[PDB]
Amino acid sequence: QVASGRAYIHASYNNTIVTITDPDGNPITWSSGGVIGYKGSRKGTPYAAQLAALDAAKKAMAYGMQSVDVIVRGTGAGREQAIRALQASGLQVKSIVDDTPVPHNGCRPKKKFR
Amino acid sequence: PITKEEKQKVIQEFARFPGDTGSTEVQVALLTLRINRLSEHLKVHKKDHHSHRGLLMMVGQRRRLLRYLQREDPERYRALIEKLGIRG
Amino acid sequence: AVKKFKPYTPSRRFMTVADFSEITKTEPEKSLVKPLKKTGGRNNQGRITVRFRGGGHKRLYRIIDFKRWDKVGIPAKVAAIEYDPNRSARIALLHYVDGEKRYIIAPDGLQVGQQVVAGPDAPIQVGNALPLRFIPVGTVVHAVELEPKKGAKLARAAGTSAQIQGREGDYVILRLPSGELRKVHGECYATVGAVGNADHKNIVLGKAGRSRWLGRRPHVRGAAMNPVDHPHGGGEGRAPRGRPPASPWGWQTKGLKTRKRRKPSSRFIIARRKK
Amino acid sequence: AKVKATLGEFDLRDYRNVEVLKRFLSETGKILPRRRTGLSAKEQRILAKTIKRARILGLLPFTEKLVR
Amino acid sequence: MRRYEVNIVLNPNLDQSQLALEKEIIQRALENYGARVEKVEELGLRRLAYPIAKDPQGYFLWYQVEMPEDRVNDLARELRIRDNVRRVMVVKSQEPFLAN
RNA sequence: GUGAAAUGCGCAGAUACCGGGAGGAACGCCGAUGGCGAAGGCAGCCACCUGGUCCACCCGUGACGCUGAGGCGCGAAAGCGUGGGGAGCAAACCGGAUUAGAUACCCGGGUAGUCCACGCCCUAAACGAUGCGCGCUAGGUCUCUGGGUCUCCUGGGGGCCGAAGCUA
Ligand SMILES: [Mg+2]
Ligand SMILES: [Mg+2]
Ligand SMILES: [Mg+2]
Ligand SMILES: [Mg+2]
Ligand SMILES: [Mg+2]
Ligand SMILES: [Mg+2]
Ligand SMILES: [Mg+2]
Ligand SMILES: [Mg+2]
Ligand SMILES: [Mg+2]
Ligand SMILES: [Mg+2]
Ligand SMILES: [Mg+2]
Ligand SMILES: [Mg+2]
Ligand SMILES: [Mg+2]
Ligand SMILES: [Mg+2]
Ligand SMILES: [Mg+2]
Ligand SMILES: [Mg+2]
Ligand SMILES: [Mg+2]
Ligand SMILES: [Mg+2]
Ligand SMILES: [Mg+2]
Ligand SMILES: [Mg+2]
Ligand SMILES: [Mg+2]
Ligand SMILES: [Mg+2]
Ligand SMILES: [Mg+2]
Ligand SMILES: [Mg+2]
Ligand SMILES: [Mg+2]
Ligand SMILES: [Mg+2]
Ligand SMILES: [Mg+2]
Ligand SMILES: [Mg+2]
Ligand SMILES: [Mg+2]
Ligand SMILES: [Mg+2]
Ligand SMILES: [Mg+2]
Ligand SMILES: [Mg+2]
Ligand SMILES: [Mg+2]
Ligand SMILES: [Mg+2]
Ligand SMILES: [Mg+2]
Ligand SMILES: [Mg+2]
Ligand SMILES: [Mg+2]
Ligand SMILES: [Mg+2]
Ligand SMILES: [Mg+2]
Ligand SMILES: [Mg+2]
Ligand SMILES: [Mg+2]
Ligand SMILES: [Mg+2]
Ligand SMILES: [Mg+2]
Ligand SMILES: [Mg+2]
Ligand SMILES: [Mg+2]
Ligand SMILES: [Mg+2]
Ligand SMILES: [Mg+2]
Ligand SMILES: [Mg+2]
Ligand SMILES: [Mg+2]
Ligand SMILES: [Mg+2]
Ligand SMILES: [Mg+2]
Ligand SMILES: [Mg+2]
Ligand SMILES: [Mg+2]
Ligand SMILES: [Mg+2]
Ligand SMILES: [Mg+2]
Ligand SMILES: [Mg+2]
Ligand SMILES: [Mg+2]
Ligand SMILES: [Mg+2]
Ligand SMILES: [Mg+2]
Ligand SMILES: [Mg+2]
Ligand SMILES: [Mg+2]
Ligand SMILES: [Mg+2]
Ligand SMILES: [Mg+2]
Ligand SMILES: [Mg+2]
Ligand SMILES: [Mg+2]
Ligand SMILES: [Mg+2]
Ligand SMILES: [Mg+2]
Ligand SMILES: [Mg+2]
Ligand SMILES: [Mg+2]
Ligand SMILES: [Mg+2]
Ligand SMILES: [Mg+2]
Ligand SMILES: [Mg+2]
Ligand SMILES: [Mg+2]
Ligand SMILES: [Mg+2]
Ligand SMILES: [Mg+2]
């Protein structure tokens, strides 16, 4: 159990998954739109991301979590909404950084991205 | 590359009077160096095709001068390609 | 290169020969050969125990140095590079400044006339030997000892090599020519570079008789025998296998793994071969 | 808010001048455009060619996290 | 014969004895390939833009030199050979190009 | 993952996250209505080798020029040969869907191939659908790169708009 830690917000088009981690980076609890209850495309919505970030903080707070830095990855829908959700949870939000991985022209993308 | 002096040494070696630059004889000689040094560059770098184009242009230029100079003075030509070792 | 032949006999059409380009001395160091007793595949009971061998050209064994730590620091000139009938790779004649002469597998790169040396403090150039621990990671390397002071055992065939992949404590990690990832001891010597004659794979024997020159007597199919003879033997006409395909001794021969389950060297093999 | 102005004499080919250069990267490290640097065409190229060289030596980043 | 700027980054956690030793191997090496040192700016430690060899700091060297053209490349390889040299960059030297 | 799904992956512990490692491919920002090349085409960074090209000086040669049937060379992609390499992608092919059906479009898989070396093939909306050179016939503005006395003028490129004029 720890006081402070991290929040990782995976924001795709089809979903938002959120995992809360320890100081060093190892997971305490996580959630996604599926976990909070939606299947299919509804998981991709900002509401879904909301519930999921909320349930995420809640679940973390039960192990003592109070302070969290927030890493946001992925140009998704429930991206920004998931952020609101985190602040309003009764968790500190010590900082907010976007760390979306992006190629310096790496691998060839699937056809769908060309 | 070609050293600036090496250019000169040839420039001088082939010049018609101690003022001479850019005469038939000199151009020919000068070219003959740019050719031969490239000919070699290509012997190694076989896949360098563009630079072959250059060589191809260079050779052609030299052929032109030779045809002219041969029209104007047989013995002067006969001598020049002798001195550069050429008609093969 | 590799040498082709105009197709003046039907065999000559395809047959290729080695180019022998890198070879510079055509007689072996008299003081370094010893005669090899041909076996014809038969053991001391007299019994054939490896099939279809015999009748190859005569050979002299060239004594090769697979140790090298033998003479640390004593440097040496590369006198000649010669053919060796007993290996795919070529051998290099070393004149040590000492005056001792020895033969090593010629690495690809070795130019006759150059100098080489073995020891922890050897320069990392082609032909030198050092403990693996003192070999820079990523460098490709041949003739590798598998345990210390025990003699080069790994990558000795024409064109083979290994790659150091990182160290871990006492051991270092190689990609053996086969792709396997194995931990070898750091104190094991290896020679920098890869084995020469790397074109050896592209030789086309061309005719039965060449296979014969090489000591390889004709090989007969299980399919072509009788049932007393082989799992695959018999059937009226041609036949498929009619069972899982097997060696003469009955064991399955497609896919069946065969390494000892509980071998101690298992502890040191990281990643079995690929492909 | 033109960067070219904000600095006096500066060599463009000084790939070590970590102090000057770093002013030309976004807060995420991306090399800045002329609409922000104020370079002309030619200048711009020399700058870019050397920033990169820096990043190779270890003095300038290739990328940096966006912070809010 | 031309003017170049050999940069080199070494292991940060070397004692001044080790560090010096590498500097010797280097300095011999330049001499061995027939470098002729002109300027020489040893700039020591410096925090890096990114962890090279998983290590935030870096010990910097810099040598302007006049060496033969052909040999320059081989030098660089030979420079990099050590488990301790962590970058080598060898640049053809040019006249500063200034703004303002 | 999609329009929504399903196939697929996942309690045999997947996703999401942290650290180490392996490997191959392409080089984000800069980047442009940009630059280079005869064309095909060429993009991280370094060095070596090497071609074309522009300017300025107006020093040399003295019509040595232009073109070019044949010849010769280069010639994207796909494809072939020999041998490497194979992460991502992906013909073929498997499966899920959509649909009346769906040998497609969408989704999950997937082998050549895509990458290297060497050798072939010699094609194209290989397009400016515009052959090369030279002379002459308003300007206006944008731009890249030289030279000047640096307002601006003078060369060489890349655009736009327009005199005259051509044009169905
Ligand atoms: Mg979804
Ligand atoms: Mg020309
Ligand atoms: Mg002629
Ligand atoms: Mg050969
Ligand atoms: Mg032949
Ligand atoms: Mg033949
Ligand atoms: Mg013949
Ligand atoms: Mg015949
Ligand atoms: Mg025949
Ligand atoms: Mg042979
Ligand atoms: Mg040979
Ligand atoms: Mg004999
Ligand atoms: Mg004897
Ligand atoms: Mg014997
Ligand atoms: Mg006996
Ligand atoms: Mg007996
Ligand atoms: Mg017998
Ligand atoms: Mg047998
Ligand atoms: Mg036998
Ligand atoms: Mg041999
Ligand atoms: Mg083969
Ligand atoms: Mg074969
Ligand atoms: Mg034999
Ligand atoms: Mg056989
Ligand atoms: Mg048979
Ligand atoms: Mg059969
Ligand atoms: Mg049969
Ligand atoms: Mg029979
Ligand atoms: Mg029986
Ligand atoms: Mg019997
Ligand atoms: Mg039987
Ligand atoms: Mg049978
Ligand atoms: Mg039968
Ligand atoms: Mg039969
Ligand atoms: Mg049968
Ligand atoms: Mg039958
Ligand atoms: Mg029958
Ligand atoms: Mg039969
Ligand atoms: Mg049967
Ligand atoms: Mg069968
Ligand atoms: Mg059967
Ligand atoms: Mg063992
Ligand atoms: Mg290194
Ligand atoms: Mg369980
Ligand atoms: Mg990871
Ligand atoms: Mg353009
Ligand atoms: Mg152009
Ligand atoms: Mg004049
Ligand atoms: Mg033609
Ligand atoms: Mg082609
Ligand atoms: Mg192709
Ligand atoms: Mg193909
Ligand atoms: Mg085919
Ligand atoms: Mg192929
Ligand atoms: Mg075939
Ligand atoms: Mg293949
Ligand atoms: Mg189907
Ligand atoms: Mg169906
Ligand atoms: Mg289908
Ligand atoms: Mg597909
Ligand atoms: Mg796929
Ligand atoms: Mg094939
Ligand atoms: Mg044609
Ligand atoms: Mg076009
Ligand atoms: Mg055009
Ligand atoms: Mg038409
Ligand atoms: Mg046409
Ligand atoms: Mg034409
Ligand atoms: Mg016309
Ligand atoms: Mg201008
Ligand atoms: Mg100007
Ligand atoms: Mg213009
Ligand atoms: Mg117009
Ligand atoms: Mg009009
Ligand atoms: Mg018309």
mmCIF file of N, CA, C and O (backbone and C1' of nucleotides) and ligand atoms in Angstrom, chain F residues 80-82 113-114, ligand 54:
data_model
loop_
_atom_site.group_PDB
_atom_site.id
_atom_site.type_symbol
_atom_site.label_atom_id
_atom_site.label_comp_id
_atom_site.label_asym_id
_atom_site.label_seq_id
_atom_site.Cartn_x
_atom_site.Cartn_y
_atom_site.Cartn_z
ATOM 1 P P C F 80 8.853 -14.128 -58.408
ATOM 2 O "O5'" C F 80 10.048 -14.639 -59.340
ATOM 3 C "C5'" C F 80 9.779 -15.271 -60.577
ATOM 4 C "C4'" C F 80 11.025 -15.469 -61.413
ATOM 5 C "C3'" C F 80 12.252 -16.042 -60.732
ATOM 6 O "O3'" C F 80 12.241 -17.442 -60.531
ATOM 7 C "C1'" C F 80 12.885 -14.224 -62.042
ATOM 8 P P G F 81 12.851 -17.979 -59.145
ATOM 9 O "O5'" G F 81 14.413 -18.026 -59.389
ATOM 10 C "C5'" G F 81 14.941 -18.555 -60.589
ATOM 11 C "C4'" G F 81 16.429 -18.388 -60.615
ATOM 12 C "C3'" G F 81 17.138 -18.609 -59.297
ATOM 13 O "O3'" G F 81 17.337 -19.971 -59.030
ATOM 14 C "C1'" G F 81 18.002 -16.698 -60.362
ATOM 15 P P U F 82 17.195 -20.533 -57.550
ATOM 16 O "O5'" U F 82 18.586 -20.144 -56.895
ATOM 17 C "C5'" U F 82 19.775 -20.459 -57.574
ATOM 18 C "C4'" U F 82 20.967 -19.819 -56.932
ATOM 19 C "C3'" U F 82 20.959 -19.688 -55.432
ATOM 20 O "O3'" U F 82 21.278 -20.886 -54.779
ATOM 21 C "C1'" U F 82 21.709 -17.688 -56.373
ATOM 22 P P G F 113 10.494 -14.218 -51.627
ATOM 23 O "O5'" G F 113 10.100 -12.725 -52.036
ATOM 24 C "C5'" G F 113 9.543 -12.416 -53.301
ATOM 25 C "C4'" G F 113 8.609 -11.239 -53.214
ATOM 26 C "C3'" G F 113 9.182 -9.992 -52.607
ATOM 27 O "O3'" G F 113 9.962 -9.286 -53.539
ATOM 28 C "C1'" G F 113 7.061 -10.397 -51.674
ATOM 29 P P U F 114 11.257 -8.489 -53.057
ATOM 30 O "O5'" U F 114 10.692 -7.388 -52.061
ATOM 31 C "C5'" U F 114 10.001 -6.259 -52.553
ATOM 32 C "C4'" U F 114 9.324 -5.527 -51.441
ATOM 33 C "C3'" U F 114 10.229 -4.850 -50.423
ATOM 34 O "O3'" U F 114 10.766 -3.614 -50.851
ATOM 35 C "C1'" U F 114 8.506 -6.012 -49.327
HETATM 36 MG MG MG G 54 14.078 -12.482 -54.983
#
